[PDB]
Ligand binder design. Sequence first.
Ligand SMILES: Nc1nc(=O)c2c([nH]1)NC[C@@H](CNc1ccc(C(=O)N[C@@H](CCC(=O)O)C(=O)O)cc1)N2C=O
Ligand SMILES: Nc1nc(=O)c2c([nH]1)NC[C@@H](CNc1ccc(C(=O)N[C@@H](CCC(=O)O)C(=O)O)cc1)N2C=O
Ligand SMILES: Cc1cn([C@H]2C[C@H](O)[C@@H](COP(=O)(O)OP(=O)(O)O)O2)c(=O)[nH]c1=O
Ligand SMILES: Cc1cn([C@H]2C[C@H](O)[C@@H](COP(=O)(O)OP(=O)(O)O)O2)c(=O)[nH]c1=O
Ligand SMILES: [Cl-]
Ligand SMILES: [Cl-]
Ligand SMILES: [Cl-]
Ligand SMILES: [Cl-]
Ligand SMILES: [Cl-]
Ligand SMILES: [Cl-]
Ligand SMILES: [Cl-]
Lengths: 274, 273
Amino acid sequence: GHMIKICIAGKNNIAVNSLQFILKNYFEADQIVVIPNKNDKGIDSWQKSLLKFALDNNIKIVTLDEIYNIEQIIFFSLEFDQIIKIENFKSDRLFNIHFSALPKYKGVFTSITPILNNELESGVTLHRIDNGIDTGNIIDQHCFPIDINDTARDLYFNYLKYGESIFKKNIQTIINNSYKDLKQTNINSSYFSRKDINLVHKINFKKTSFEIHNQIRAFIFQEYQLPIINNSKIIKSILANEFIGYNVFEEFENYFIISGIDGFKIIAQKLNKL
Amino acid sequence: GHMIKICIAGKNNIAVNSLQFILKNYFEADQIVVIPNKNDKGIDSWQKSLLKFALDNNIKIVTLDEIYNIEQIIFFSLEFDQIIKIENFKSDRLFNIHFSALPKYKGVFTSITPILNNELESGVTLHRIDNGIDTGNIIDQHCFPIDINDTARDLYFNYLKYGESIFKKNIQTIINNSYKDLKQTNINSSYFSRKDINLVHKINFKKTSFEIHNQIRAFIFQEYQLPIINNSKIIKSILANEFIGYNVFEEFENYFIISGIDGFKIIAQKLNK
Ligand SMILES: Nc1nc(=O)c2c([nH]1)NC[C@@H](CNc1ccc(C(=O)N[C@@H](CCC(=O)O)C(=O)O)cc1)N2C=O
Ligand SMILES: Nc1nc(=O)c2c([nH]1)NC[C@@H](CNc1ccc(C(=O)N[C@@H](CCC(=O)O)C(=O)O)cc1)N2C=O
Ligand SMILES: Cc1cn([C@H]2C[C@H](O)[C@@H](COP(=O)(O)OP(=O)(O)O)O2)c(=O)[nH]c1=O
Ligand SMILES: Cc1cn([C@H]2C[C@H](O)[C@@H](COP(=O)(O)OP(=O)(O)O)O2)c(=O)[nH]c1=O
Ligand SMILES: [Cl-]
Ligand SMILES: [Cl-]
Ligand SMILES: [Cl-]
Ligand SMILES: [Cl-]
Ligand SMILES: [Cl-]
Ligand SMILES: [Cl-]
Ligand SMILES: [Cl-]
């Protein structure tokens, strides 16, 4: 019977827009609490700030320890950074939106790992939180394409959009506790940790054009880093069906022309191109 | 035309059985020549020797240099070990059966690479040889499952069986030169070289059970090697859907019980040897 009905924990446009949605449609400000990620400085930047939205709309900021004992609270992680232990919570209403098509690509850097592993599609998945990393039972999933020249950043913005949508699609059944779920399968399950990914990726050119292009574009996310080829930052990679011969590599003022062991043209655009 | 009509280059039961098939159904011995792989000494083992079958059936052994100038020769690579350059040959009738579902898994160790990269299926592909590594246009393909507990060796034996079948399915149209082919796509194309694969694999246990299982069984091919956990060789991995808790690892006299970050039970059976 507590005042507080729901907690939004996490960051970025998905957390802010989902919070705004529930404030507009389901709960009053005094029924909601927020746990921003540790790094949230309260500044709207290339993403909206959850801390800023809470402060601007009179939504209380809390810690996990403040909400553990709240009976029946709905806890939603939307890019939240702390692993929870479910036995801390009195409530069993604990949910996450994970930026992959589970069971594939559990873990981190999920705007990098599907592209680096040659996928043509990804997804967002709403699931129950259990004590493992993105291992809980799936409630809903939406799969969508990774277009051939999408960068990690382009994929991330698609996760924000489709994740916000799957939140809205499912929130009423979460609130009325009538949702259905299904155990994740063992097969196809994959996982990457921060140690598995070197963000300063050294490209293996003894690979197909599709693999070289994926090795480039998986690391294009300018707020964090850009790939460097021959001491030049790369902002875009374009893969064509044109055969140009095997193992081409040529540097120009504004781009590189590259092909791998199957000979298909890649244009890797330098950041300095006007 | 020249006496010689066809060259079978390569090894193992796919080469021997495809050569037997064409000797029975199409060609006389004098019309066929063979190029065995470098290490074939004419002794059958866990696969038949191509060199031995040729000698036993009065088929001549040749080098590539001896066939370049033979007009209209059919050249067929069946696990052959040398990259050819097509402009050496007068003939454009140059074909390979590659042990993967192209365009995926160009290159080598293709009983290892699909498993290691978490595939549920593989295939055999008949294609024209061009100057790149498994890059030429596809003539036919047969895909098939990698069962959940199959090892690299099990996969290899399936390539030999399905590869022999796709050879028999297509040989008449190759002989008649009526076959059809299609360029490979750029998307999905992948490639592994010998440098990419360390055959003494160190397992990463901070992975899912399906990934740990695949890391083990991708290297089980006893005639070459077996993967080693705590100085025991593993002969079989078994992945179940039973949840046993996250990140289990326990060693027993005859097996290990392992789970990864998602908690599904693996039994890694030690070689009884
Ligand atoms: N129990 C739980 N399950 C989840 O699926 C989940 C939560 N909590 N809390 C919110 C969010 C947190 N997700 C994560 C994912 C990875 C790390 C992390 O620190 N990974 C380390 C390895 C940690 C380890 O090995 O124990 C790394 O280096 O990658 C932290 C939080 N989340 C779902 O999104
Ligand atoms: N031109 C050509 N294309 C082919 O697709 C083909 C042939 N020849 N000849 C028969 C067979 C030979 N396949 C191969 C495949 C890889 C290596 C090899 O030596 N790979 C080295 C890398 C070589 C390099 O980078 O140039 C390695 O270390 O992996 C040799 C023969 N074959 C299709 O089967
Ligand atoms: C932290 C970081 C993220 N990214 C990108 C790729 C990630 O999928 C995306 C979101 O990362 P983020 O959610 O901040 O990290 P995590 O995956 O550890 O929870 O930002 C980088 O490219 N480089 C980085 O250094
Ligand atoms: C040479 C080698 C092969 N193999 C297995 C996996 C290979 O897919 C299969 C056949 O290899 P093989 O055709 O001899 O070598 P390549 O791929 O270089 O042409 O045998 C091993 O497991 N270990 C080895 O050392
Ligand atoms: Cl906290
Ligand atoms: Cl669950
Ligand atoms: Cl699933
Ligand atoms: Cl040659
Ligand atoms: Cl030469
Ligand atoms: Cl071709
Ligand atoms: Cl194709």
